[PDB]
């Protein structure tokens, strides 16, 4: 599907709500505790990647194809939110534009 | 030095650094003898919107003033997509490998 094959990829990160049981009966029972307190959780996360990139030196004379926002007027701008508040991606953008000698 | 040794090398390229940027160009030129070794008066005729008085000179000159002399269409693309502004700083000019021929 494309990508970087890794022997030792980034570690999976797993999270759970710790169970909080509801009021236990007064008499003892060895069976599992069936009833819990309904709860959920929320909070912010952040991810910081450091990328290394190969600089481009090409002596070709004439200009190259490059990615350009669509040249047309439109009811909704490209890669932007619409009236209802929904973010819309117009195109899958490949990485291959700049030419290189074979 | 001498008849048999070149006085320079060919430099044309573009060096892209972070802040400065340095463009090199070199060309081959041909200089005739203008006005057969004479200064001359030049002037118009009659009354009109185009009338002039001046002199023509037996001298040539080097004009590099236009942009595309210094930049290739790829460098120009590379310039204008990535940047909000440009201004000149220094320039360096050189003549070499002069050769004079008689007809
Ligand atoms: N994406 C990626 N991850 C890991 N290993 C890779 C990848 N692509 C190629 N290889 C292997 C193929 C060769 O055995 C070696 C050197 O690449 P060779 O083609 O000069 O690495």
What are the DSSP calls for B9-58, one per residue?
A: ----EEEE-SS-EEEE---------GGGT--EEEE--SSSSS--EEEE-S
Of A55, A59, A52, A65, which is closest to residue A98 (Cα–Cα)?
A: A65
Q: What is the resolution of this structure in A?
A: 3.0
Give residues (CB < 6 A) around ligand 1: A 4-5
Interchain contact A63–B (C-beta under 8 A): yes
Q: How many CB pairs under 8 A join A and B?
A: 16
Bridge partners for B16 per DSSP: B21
Q: Return the residue of A nearest to B14 by Cα.
A: A59
Residues B39, B27 contacting (CB under 8 angstroms): no
Residues B43, B53 contacting (CB under 8 angstroms): yes
Distance CA B22, CA B10 (A): 16
Residue A89: C-alpha distances to residues A32, A47, A72 (Å): 49, 22, 16
3-state class percentages of chain A: helix first, strand second, coil last, to nearest 5:
0, 5, 95
Of A19, A62, A64, which is closest to residue A38 (Cα–Cα)?
A: A19
Please state the separation of Cα A21 from the chain's center in Å.
34
A70 Cα to chain B: minimum distance (Å)? 15
Residues B40, B56 contacting (CB under 8 angstroms): yes
Distance CA A97, CA A56 (A): 12
Angle of CA points A49, A54, A55, to nearest 5°: 120
> Residues, chain A, total?
102
Whether residue A64 and residue B73 make contact (CB cut-off 8 A), yes or no, is: no
> Residues, chain B, total?
103
Please state the separation of Cα A76 from the chain's center in Å.
24
Please state the separation of Cα A29 from the chain's center in Å.
46
Largest pairwise CA distance in chain B: 58
Of B29, B30, B56, B61, which is closest to residue B42 (Cα–Cα)?
A: B56
Bin B89: left if φ > 0, else alpha if -120 < ψ < 50, else beta. alpha
Whether residue B74 and residue A66 make contact (CB cut-off 8 A), yes or no, is: no
Whether residue A63 and residue B81 make contact (CB cut-off 8 A), yes or no, is: no
Residues B70, B23 contacting (CB under 8 angstroms): yes
Taking only Cα atoms into account, the Rg of chain B, rounded to an integer number of angstroms, comes to 21
């Amino acid at each position: 599907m494309g990508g970087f094959g890794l022997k030792n990829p980034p570690p999976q990160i797993l999270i759970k709500n710790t169970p909080v049981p509801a009021d236990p009966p007064t008499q003892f029972s060895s069976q599992k505790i069936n009833s819990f307190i309904t709860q959920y959780s929320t909070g912010q996360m952040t991810v910081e990647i450091e990328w290394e990139l190969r600089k481009e030196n090409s002596k070709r004379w004439n200009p190259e194809i490059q990615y350009t926002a669509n040249f047309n007027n439109s009811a909704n701008a490209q890669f932007s939110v619409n009236n209802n508040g929904l973010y819309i991606e117009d195109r899958t953008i490949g990485t291959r534009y700049l030419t290189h000698t074979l | 030095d001498g008849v048999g040794q070149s006085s320079g090398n060919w430099h044309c390229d573009s060096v892209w650094m972070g802040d400065r940027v340095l463009t090199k160009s070199t060309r081959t030129w041909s200089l005739p003898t203008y006005n057969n070794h004479l200064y001359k008066q030049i002037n118009g005729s009659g009354t009109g919107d185009a009338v002039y008085f001046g002199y023509s000179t037996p001298w040539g000159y080097f004009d590099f003033n236009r942009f595309h002399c210094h930049f290739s269409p790829r460098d120009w693309q590379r310039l204008v997509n990535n940047h909000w502004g440009i201004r000149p700083r220094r320039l360096n000019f050189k003549l070499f490998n002069i050769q004079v021929k008689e007809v």
